[PDB]
């Protein structure tokens, strides 16, 4: 019971730590680059107007 | 005498900065030293505790004269500076003396004329350059250069100028560069041979 738990629990930690890393290194930076582009383009439209 | 705030006061020579601007703090003075004639920035924000810089410069630095500029500050913040500074003291030749014997304050709240809030650092640096020319070492503190830049932006808006970076006028970076280029150690104009300096600390609010 301890070894079937331990081997099943080790897998779920790896999958979870991979999501914490992917959100920190891949997903959040893509949102921040998008959001920085939008602000830059809205300054352009304002200067054209 | 009378001098234009936007003209740099002339010197025989401008010199490299060699001597520390000591503050009496162990950090700062050891790990992150400034020179006499140097330039420094600090973050201007509520909780951080700016007053240790201002009060260590005023009480304990090897400056001969202090110039402080408020340049569009909140009314209750400016009131705190103008209350506190007269109460600061230092020990000279075994006698306690007021900080206001070697200090001048420029003070501007957010409802003063926008022309004053923008002129403020040019008034404060021109006062600093006048005591440099006597052969004193001066520290100048600007309480927030972000409030100065917002006044410069409002003036360009009144003039209907092209809005460039984030609505700030095209010259913003040149105005900041030309201002901080007035810091330094110098060989003064005129006959009795002497050296002075002006060191600038400018707070900024990202």
């Amino acid at each position: 019971s301890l070894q079937t738990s331990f081997v099943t629990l080790d897998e779920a930690i790896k999958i979870t730590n991979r999501r914490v890393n992917a959100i920190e290194h891949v997903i959040i930076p893509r949102i921040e680059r998008t959001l920085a582009y939008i602000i830059t383009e809205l300054d352009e439209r304002e200067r054209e107007e | 005498q009378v001098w234009p705030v936007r003209q740099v006061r002339p010197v025989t020579e401008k010199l490299p900065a060699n001597h520390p601007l000591l503050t009496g703090q162990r950090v700062l003075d050891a790990l992150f030293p400034c020179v006499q004639g140097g330039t420094t920035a600090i973050p201007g924000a509520f909780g951080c505790g700016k007053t240790v810089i201002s009060q260590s410069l005023s009480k304990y630095s090897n400056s001969d004269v202090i110039i402080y500029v408020g340049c569009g500050e909140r009314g209750n913040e400016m009131s705190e500076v103008l209350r506190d500074f007269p109460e600061l003291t230092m020990e000279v030749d075994g006698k306690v003396e007021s900080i206001m014997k070697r200090t001048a304050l420029v003070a501007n709240t957010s409802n003063m004329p926008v022309a004053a809030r923008e002129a403020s650092i040019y008034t404060g640096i021109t006062l600093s350059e006048y005591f440099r020319d006597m052969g004193y070492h001066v520290s100048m503190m600007a309480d927030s250069t972000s409030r100065w830049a917002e006044a410069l932006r409002e003036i360009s808006g009144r003039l209907a100028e092209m809005p460039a970076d984030s609505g700030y006028p095209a010259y913003l970076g040149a105005r900041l560069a030309s201002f901080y280029e007035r810091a330094g150690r110098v060989k003064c104009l005129g006959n009795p041979e002497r050296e002075g300096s002006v060191s600038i600390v400018g707070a900024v609010s990202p």
Binding site: - | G75, N76, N111, E154
Partner: protein, 464 residues
């Protein structure tokens, strides 16, 4: 002394365009002068000189330009700018946004006439803020406490109860009554719909507080210049009451977001180009001219404290109106859509809220010695309670420790007893602090790490 000369009346209208009438042959035109127009049918309107150039003046009419023509319309130039009569008889009165009475009382006998533009207070004469203004609302008085001479906005959004909160502050506000008739309120409301305006007028009469209050109402379909004038009449009154009659004045300015909409319109009528985000480039210097009419001054026993109230689009704090207000004022009280949806009132969120002068208002001789410690510990428990409540949905309630279950009990009882309060329930700061201790007593006294041992010894135990 007096102005003495007879008035000139002109029938020299050159043109009419939008809100503006243009006249020529005017004798030495004065900028910002008030003028009276009489229409062809005998109707009367008034306006202000918006620009002068040689013999030409252009007048912005407050009412419409409809029915005006170049032949029969006459304009009478009064010789002077806008000045308001002012007196202590203005407490207990209701006025419109031009200072005209709307309460069936008579027109004001002046103790003085003042220029509504005022003058800036000298930085040498302003002394630092001090004791509390007691609003009667626990989320403000207990944790975002307001000093005499502070300026602190309420940040809100459309459909949230910020007018019900403003009305409750107006009914309940005063000094702390430790161990006064020297307290007054000026209430100003800009761009108010008739339902909201009837509520303010009715609620202050019905709940019998008018003897402390001067009320200025500007409705959503009043002239947009009266909205520009409204904060200036209110603050010109607060300056007479505070710095000549020595009162502590509370000023409530309602929708500075409505004020900015009128400012943008007067700017457009001058044919200026729209500034950053569509507001005038000078909107900081304009808002600072309202908000810095505040403080304590040397040698006079009165003060002015301001509570601006603002509505934000998209619930976005980064819009020019709340953003420029943040650079001038010293704190924020934040009104929250989620607490409102959860049926909590007043829906004030204490985690993003801050009063930057709270340490100057509270403590021994100003409130009670434990106030700072109780405020720090209630904030610390609530910030942990919201974090335990989040992990409970991840780990399940059987994985929570006994200490997590204490924070989970505190969180529920804090929101039901401290934050939740009636719209006609008034708590002193002492009652607020006692409700604060009833909640802190949920914990073993070892948990209360923000409170020193001396405060725990005097206040943690119950007593007969």
């Amino acid at each position: 002394n007096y102005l003495s000369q007879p008035r000139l009346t002109y029938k020299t209208v050159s043109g009419v365009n939008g809100p503006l009438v243009i006249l020529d042959h005017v004798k030495f035109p004065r900028y910002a002068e008030i003028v009276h127009l009489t229409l062809p049918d005998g109707t009367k309107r008034s306006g202000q000189v918006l620009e002068v150039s040689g013999s030409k003046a252009v007048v912005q009419v407050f009412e419409g330009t409809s029915g005006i023509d170049a032949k029969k319309t006459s304009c009478e130039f009064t010789g002077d700018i806008l000045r308001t009569p002012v007196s202590e008889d203005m407490l207990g009165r209701v006025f419109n946004g031009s200072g005209k009475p709307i309460d069936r009382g008579p027109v004001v006998l002046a103790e003085d006439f003042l220029d509504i533009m005022g003058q800036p207070i000298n930085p040498q004469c302003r002394i630092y803020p001090e004791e509390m203004i007691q609003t009667g609302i626990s989320a403000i008085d207990g944790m975002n406490s307001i000093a005499r001479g502070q300026k602190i906005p309420i940040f809100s959004a459309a459909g949230l109860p910020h007018n019900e909160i403003a009305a409750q502050i107006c009914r309940q506000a005063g000094l702390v009554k430790k161990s006064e008739e020297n307290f007054a309120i000026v209430f100003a409301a800009m761009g108010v719909n008739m339902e909201t305006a009837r509520f303010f007028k009715s609620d202050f009469e019905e709940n019998g507080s008018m003897d402390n209050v001067c009320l200025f109402l500007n409705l959503a379909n009043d002239p947009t210049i009266e909205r520009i004038i409204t904060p200036r009449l209110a603050l010109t009154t607060a300056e007479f009451l505070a710095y000549q009659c020595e009162k502590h004045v509370l000023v409530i300015l309602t929708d500075m977001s409505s004020y900015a909409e009128a400012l943008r319109e007067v700017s457009a009528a001058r044919e200026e180009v729209p500034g950053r985000r569509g507001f005038p480039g000078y909107m900081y210097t304009d808002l600072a001219t309202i908000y810095e009419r505040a403080g304590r001054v040397e040698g006079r026993n009165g003060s002015i404290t301001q509570i601006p109230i603002l509505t934000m689009p998209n619930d976005d704090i980064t819009h020019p109106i709340p953003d420029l207000t943040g650079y001038i004022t010293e704190g924020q009280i934040y009104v929250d859509r989620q607490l409102h949806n959860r049926q909590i009132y007043p829906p004030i969120n204490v985690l993003p809220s801050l009063s930057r002068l709270m340490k100057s208002a509270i403590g021994e001789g100003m409130t009670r010695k434990d106030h700072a410690d109780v405020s720090n510990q209630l904030y610390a428990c609530y910030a942990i309670g919201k974090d335990v409540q989040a992990m409970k949905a991840v780990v399940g309630e059987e994985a929570l420790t006994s200490d997590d279950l204490l924070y989970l009990e505190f969180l529920q009882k804090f929101e039901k007893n401290f934050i939740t309060q009636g719209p006609y329930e008034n708590r002193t700061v002492y009652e607020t602090l006692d409700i604060g201790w009833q909640l802190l007593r949920i914990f073993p006294k070892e948990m209360l790490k923000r409170i020193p041992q001396s405060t725990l010894s005097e206040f943690y135990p119950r007593d007969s």
